[PDB]
Structure 1
Amino acid sequence: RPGGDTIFGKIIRKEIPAKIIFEDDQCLAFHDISPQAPTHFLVIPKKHISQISAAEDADESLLGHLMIVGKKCAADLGLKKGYRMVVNEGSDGGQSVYHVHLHVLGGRQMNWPPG
């Protein structure tokens, strides 16, 4: 559209508000509307990739970029005792938004199994 037709596309295009933490030419990081920990944000690419199973070999750097941006935002938000990054794929993974996104949660002890 550009950005995609999900709500994430609307956020990228600034059509609906979000608490934006950081943004560059490739991605955007913003807080989750339903935090599962004291700090819970998402890092999403500006390029619409619907699922991680649909990402191409060429999307490799982009995907790695979401993680580098995720670690920089986490440190800047003070998650110095650690955090957990999560990517959900499909029904079994619990994915609800069909635009690839990385979850970053911290501020409390994360338990195991990870769901």
Structure 2
Amino acid sequence: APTIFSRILDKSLPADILYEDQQCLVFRDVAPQAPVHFLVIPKKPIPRISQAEEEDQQLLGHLLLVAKQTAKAEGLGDGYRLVINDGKLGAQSVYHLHIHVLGGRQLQWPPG
């Protein structure tokens, strides 16, 4: 069952960790799509946003607040984009919930 994020969480795969607390971990994407590209993940292994439930409300808000404070720390004041992919049509790579945060270039429209 475990995805590659389990190695990031258990620190067996070195990552550039920007923030950690008991609920979440933030690290740089190693296949970046922007000059700044990091991932915010829960420690609870929710596989996808479609499988989050009411009990996850607080955690989901926490992930968004951590995303925006990390964006400020990474100097994304002129703007950035948050992306959550669900399933195959969403292009979800890894079946552990993650928020992409992209900045440092102009992001285009549509968003894929």
**TM-score clears 0.5:** yes
Q: What does 1:9-24 align with in structure 2 at a 5 Å threshold?
A: 9-24=6-21
Structure-2 separation of matches of 1:40 and 1:25: 22
- The C-alpha deviation readout for 1:62-97, integer Å capped at 9, x for no partner, is 111111000000100100101000000000000010
Question: Match for residue 34 of structure 1?
Answer: 31
Pick the aligned partner of 2:54 from 57, 63, 72: 57
1:80 counterpart = 2:73 = no
Question: Match for residue 106 of structure 1?
Answer: 103
Deviation at residue 59 of structure 1 after TM alignment: 0.5
Question: Match for residue 41 of structure 2?
Answer: 44
Deviation at residue 15 of structure 1 after TM alignment: 1.1
Structure-2 separation of matches of 1:18 and 1:110: 25
- The C-alpha deviation readout for 1:5-56, integer Å capped at 9, x for no partner, is 1111111111111110010110000000011110000000000001111111
1:93 counterpart = 2:90 = yes
Sequence identity (%):
60
SS at match of 1:62: helix
SS at match of 1:84: strand
Structure-2 separation of matches of 1:51 and 1:108: 27
Root mean square deviation, CA, Å: 0.9
SS at match of 1:74: helix
- The runs of at least 4 aligned residues of structure 1 exceeding 6 Å deviation read none
Structure-1 separation of matches of 2:59 and 2:89: 24
